[PDB]
């Protein structure tokens, strides 16, 4: 829906319902600089949210991918489903 740096972005699903965009942002900031960070909707009765995160560079996005486990970002107390944004 907008102009993004090829291979730098990610669609997020399964975000805990209490997070705002700052939460989502701080997760991806641990891997590099962030360009856009956005909660884009709700799902499953309102129990999880959808997100979109664009990193400042492809290198930064690949730093995210390197910490990915079959498409999932496992942290302490949450698991996000991170998926490559294709244009």
């Amino acid at each position: 829906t907008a102009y993004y740096l090829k291979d730098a972005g990610f669609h997020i699903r399964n975000i805990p319902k209490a997070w705002n965009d700052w939460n989502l942002f701080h997760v991806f900031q641990n891997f590099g600089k962030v360009s856009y960070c956005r909660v884009v909707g709700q799902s499953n009765d309102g129990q999880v949210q959808l997100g979109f995160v664009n990193m400042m560079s492809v290198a930064d996005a690949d730093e995210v991918r390197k910490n990915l486990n079959d498409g999932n970002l496992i942290g302490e107390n949450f698991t996000l489903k991170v998926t490559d944004h294709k244009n």
Binding site: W19, N20, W22, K33, S35, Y36, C37, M56
Partner: protein, 82 residues
């Protein structure tokens, strides 16, 4: 729009608006307002780039004569603690 803005100062006085933008690499600059001052008010893409720029550049020593000062109205505000 308040949270796209940061103030930057302490950079070398010869910079033009492109040079102020170079200071801020790699964040997206949408506007720079220059006044009678040796500071500038810069509009970035969004509050997250502003937040990161203040982090990255506030206090950064450019050389023995220039220590950048970067500041904004943006506070990191997680809904639940991190």
């Amino acid at each position: 729009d308040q949270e796209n803005m940061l103030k930057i100062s302490g950079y070398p006085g010869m910079l033009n608006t492109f040079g102020i933008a170079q200071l801020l690499t790699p964040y997206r600059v949408n506007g720079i307002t220059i006044t009678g001052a040796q500071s500038a008010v810069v509009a970035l893409e969004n509050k997250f780039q502003v937040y990161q720029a203040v982090q990255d550049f506030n206090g950064k020593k450019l050389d023995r004569n220039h220590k950048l000062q970067v500041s904004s109205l943006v506070v990191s505000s997680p809904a639940v603690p991190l």
